[PDB]
Amino acid sequence: EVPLPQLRAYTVDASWLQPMAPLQIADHTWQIGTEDLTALLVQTPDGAVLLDGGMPQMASHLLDNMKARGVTPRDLRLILLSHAHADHAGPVAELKRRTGAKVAANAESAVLLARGGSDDLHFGDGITYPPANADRIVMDGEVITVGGIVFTAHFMAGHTPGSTAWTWTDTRNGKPVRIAYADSLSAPGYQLQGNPRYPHLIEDYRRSFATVRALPCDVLLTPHPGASNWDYAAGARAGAKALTCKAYADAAEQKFDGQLAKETAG
Amino acid sequence: EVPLPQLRAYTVDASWLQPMAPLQIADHTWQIGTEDLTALLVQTPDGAVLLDGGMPQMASHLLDNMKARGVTPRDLRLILLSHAHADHAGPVAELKRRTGAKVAANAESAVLLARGGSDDLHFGDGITYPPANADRIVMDGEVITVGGIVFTAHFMAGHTPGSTAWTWTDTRNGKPVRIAYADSLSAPGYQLQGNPRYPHLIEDYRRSFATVRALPCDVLLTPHPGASNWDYAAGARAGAKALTCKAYADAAEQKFDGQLAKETAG
Amino acid sequence: EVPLPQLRAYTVDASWLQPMAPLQIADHTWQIGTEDLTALLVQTPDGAVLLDGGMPQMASHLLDNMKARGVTPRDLRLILLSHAHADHAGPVAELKRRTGAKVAANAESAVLLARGGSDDLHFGDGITYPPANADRIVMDGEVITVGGIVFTAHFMAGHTPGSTAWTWTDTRNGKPVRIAYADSLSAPGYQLQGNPRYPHLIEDYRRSFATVRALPCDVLLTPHPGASNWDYAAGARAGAKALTCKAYADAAEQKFDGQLAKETAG
Amino acid sequence: EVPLPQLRAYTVDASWLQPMAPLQIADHTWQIGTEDLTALLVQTPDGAVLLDGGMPQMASHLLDNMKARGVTPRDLRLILLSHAHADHAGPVAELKRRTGAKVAANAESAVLLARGGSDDLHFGDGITYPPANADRIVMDGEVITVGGIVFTAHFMAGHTPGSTAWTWTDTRNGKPVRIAYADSLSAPGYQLQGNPRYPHLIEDYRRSFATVRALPCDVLLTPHPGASNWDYAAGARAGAKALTCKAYADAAEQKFDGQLAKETAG
C-alpha cells in the first residue's frame, strides 16, 4: 500500500551554503561564514571566539577560514550562539570535537542545543542537528572575557526562548566600535497567539524589540546578514547599507504586527 | 562557484516504512512495526514493554498498533533496544514524550542514544536521529522483570559497542517458548582491521558470534527480519523459515570472514 | 601540616526532617512531606502528581505516605518542582528510579537539577544532591493536565533563576478551591546588587513579587510552610493562619528591601 | 519523636587531604595531588594532561601545583580518569569550569561521572560529587596523543564497570620508562556473588587481574599510592618499594579470593 514518508533533509537556499573568504568587520572581528549565514571570528591575544557556526555541514569551511586567519583548532577557545537552531548552531558539536572550544549559552539555548533542536516549540522534530553540551551557563547581562575582550549577553527571547544578542567593543581606524550581534526577530510559520507551547510569546517578542532598540550599537550584525541589510558579497561596501539596531527593531516590530493581524484574520 | 552540498536525508527501502497490523509471535509477544523493521510489543497484566521502535517517523504507527492491542500510552512501562542507530531507536525520544515509557539500556547504548546517533564510530554525523535519555543503566546479564516476563541482557558488542541480545520466556499452546531477540551482526561499510575508534572490533565480533550461538533460543527474532529469515508479510507462515540462533551466528561469522578478506584485498 | 578541610554535609533543623502523616488540604491535595518541608500529593483518577520532595533522605518516607494514600509507585505519574535546590528537589533522582514518575520543569530548573545543584549561582558546590533529568520542559504560563486536573506554571525567577509557582483548582466542601503553591522569595546570604553571576537579580525579584501578588489564590502554600504561616503540626488548624498570596508577596518585598538597604550599608 | 538522619559527609583520612609539592616521576610526569591520593600531571611541549584529581575539595591545590610547574589553566588540555568515584574524580567538574581541560573517558565512566557518582552499583547515593560531562568517549585499547605522549586505555572493569588502566612511555636518564597507571582492584564492602546489579562481577575482576598483570610496566602507579607500595612523602625514595604490575595483580587477586571466601562464610 502506502509507506510512511521518507525523512526530509533540511534543505536551504544555495547562498546559505556558499563559502566566502574571511571579511574583516573591525580590527579583531571577521565574518568567516557563508555568503548568507553569519559566523563571526573574534581574534584576541589569548585565543579566538566564534559567534555562531551556521549549518551543520560548515564545520570544515570554518576551520579553513580560521586557519587562513592564523587560528589553529587549539586556538579556538569559546563558541557563543545567537540561537540554537540548525542553521546557526548546526556544526557546534563537530567544532567542539575538532577544537579546543567550549560553549557558553543561557539555559534555554543549552537545553535546545543538548537535544539537537528536536522537540522544537514550533517545528517539533522537523529540523534537527547534532546535539552538543554547554560548558558554561550565562545569565542575562552577564559578561565573558577572552584576551581582555569583554562580551555581554542580552537576552531577547522570541524567535527561540533562549535567543541572545551579544555585544562587545572592538576598534577600527583608532576608534572604539561597539558591535552588536543581534539574533533573529522573525517568527517563520509560528502560531503567535494562544500558543500552548509558548503562552507568553507575544509579550517576549515585544520586550525583545525594546532590548534590541537599546543595545550599544555602532555596528549591527545579524545571523542572516540580509536582516540588517548586510551584503557579505559586496566586498568593500558589504556593510554600507547596514541598519541601526533601532531601525532593525522597528522593522521587525512592524513585520510582527503585520503577521499578528494576518493571524487574527486567518 | 560551488556551494557546500545540501544535507542528505536518511532514506530507506519502502518496505522498511510499510505499516503492518500486529502479528502475534507468542502468547504475550507481538510484532507491531513495519514489514521490514522489527518492533516487539510484550503485553503483560502489569503493563507493556517495547523492544525497538524502528525509524524516527514510526512513532504514531507504533502507538496505533498498541491501541489496537489494548495498550494505552500510560500502559507502556519500558523501552528496550537492540542498538541505538536511527533505524531501530529512531522514534524513542518521541515515544518517551507521548507515553509513560522509560528507557533501560547499557552504558554504551545510553551514550549513543543521548547523542542521537551523532559521532558514530563508523559513520560520524552521517545518520542521526532525535536524542533520548536512558532512565536505567543495565549491566551484562542483568534481568528486568515486567508482569512476570523476565528479560535478560546479553551484550553482543560489534555492530555497535552497545549492541544487545534480549532473551525471555513466553508461552504458546501452554508450552514455554524461549525467545531470543538478537541484534545485527553486520558491519556495513565498516573498517574492521586496525580501526583507531574501535581497536578490538574483531575480537568483539568473534565473542559476539559465540554469545549469539549459545543463547536460549526456541525462536530467533532480529531487528531486520530478513536477517533471521522472517517474513512478516507471510501471515501464518511468517516465522516458518526462521533461522536458529546457531545458524544466524554461523552465517554472520561467514559473512564477516568474507568481509575481512575483502578488506585485506582492498 | 594542615590538611584540606573535610567535606561538610548539608545539615538542617530537625523539624525539616521530622516525618508527619498525610495532611489533607483539599479533596485531592495532601501534604505528605515533613513538619517543616512541603511535599504535595495530588491524587487524580489517572495517577498522582508530586509537587516537591524535600531533602534527599525523604524518598522512602514519601513513598510510605503515598502508599498510605493508596498510591503505589506505579501510580505516581508526574513530579513538579518549586525550585531545584537540595531541600526541595533532593530526592527526585531516587523517586524517578523507584516510581513511574516523570519530571516537568522549566529550562533553568532542568539545568540546575541536571547538575544536582552544583555550580549554584550563590553557593557554588556547597549544597549538592543527586542529579536528575527532566522529561518535559515547560514555558511560562504553560499548563500540564493529569486526570483532568490542570496545573499552570507561573515563573517567578529570583531565589533561583528557574523558581516557579504552580496553580491548580481543587474542591472542598463542594466549592472550587484555587490553590497556589508559590516558591520561596528569600535571598539567604545572596549578593543582591552587582552580582556578576546574576546581573538582573533585583529586577527579577521585583517582577516576581508582582507575579505572586496576582496569582489565583484561594489558598497559598509554600515550600517552607512557615513562610506562608502554615503550621503542619497544628492538625485541624494547620492552615488557619495562612497568608494570602498578596500578603506573602508584600512581606517578601519588605524583607527584600530591608536586605538591599543593609547590603548598601555593609 | 525521631527525625530522619542528617546527611553524612564523605569524610576521609587526613592524609588523603594533605597537600604536597609536585613530586617528579619521570621526565614529563609529576605527582601533584596529596600525600595519599594520586593526581598525575603529564607536561608536554603541546600542553598538559591530568590523570585523576582526587577529592572534590582538591581543585585549587591542583591548580596551584600546575602553576608551580609552569602549567596555566589554558595549558591543561585533557583530563583522564582511573574511575569515576568521588575520591578520584571529585574535582573534575570544577577543573573543567576553571581551565581549558576536556574529559576523555569510556562510556561506563562517562555515565557515572555524568551522575556525579549517584546510583552507584554498590553504594547507591551514599557517596556523590559534582557531576561532569565527558567530551570524548574512548574504546578499549584506544590511544590519545598529547605532545607526543601516547596514552593507551586498558579497560579493567570491576571496582567500577568503567575502571581503566592508562599506560604511556616517558623517559628518564635518556632511557624509556613504560608507566602504567592501574586502577584500584578493591571491592570495599561489595556483594561479589550473585549481585543483580553486576551479574558478571567476578568474571570481570578475574579478567582485570590478567589485564593488569600483562601491562607494559617499568613503573606502576595507583590512585591510592599505598596499593602499589608508593610513599609520596618519602622524597627520593618515594617509588623505591613500588610493586610490579604482576605483583599488584597477584596481591589483589589473593585479597579478592579471601573476600569471596569470607562472603560465602557470611
Ligand SMILES: Cc1ccccc1C1=NC(=S)N=N1
Ligand atoms: C532552522 C529552524 C529550525 C526549526 C525551527 C525554525 C527554524 C528557523 N530559524 C530561522 S532564523 N529560520 N527558520
Ligand SMILES: Cc1ccccc1C1=NC(=S)N=N1
Ligand atoms: C543506521 C546506521 C547509522 C550509522 C551507522 C550504521 C547504521 C546501520 N545500522 C544497520 S542494522 N545498518 N546500517
Ligand SMILES: Cc1ccccc1C1=NC(=S)N=N1
Ligand atoms: C538548599 C540551598 C542550596 C544552595 C543554595 C541555597 C539554598 C537554599 N534554598 C532555600 S529555600 N534556603 N537555602
Ligand SMILES: Cc1ccccc1C1=NC(=S)N=N1
Ligand atoms: C568513593 C566510593 C564511592 C562509592 C563506592 C566506592 C567507593 C570507593 N572507591 C575506592 S578506591 N574506595 N571506596
Ligand SMILES: [Zn+2]
Ligand atoms: Zn531559528
Ligand SMILES: [Zn+2]
Ligand atoms: Zn536562521
Ligand SMILES: [Zn+2]
Ligand atoms: Zn545499526
Ligand SMILES: [Zn+2]
Ligand atoms: Zn538496522
Ligand SMILES: [Zn+2]
Ligand atoms: Zn533554595
Ligand SMILES: [Zn+2]
Ligand atoms: Zn528551601
Ligand SMILES: [Zn+2]
Ligand atoms: Zn572507587
Ligand SMILES: [Zn+2]
Ligand atoms: Zn579510591
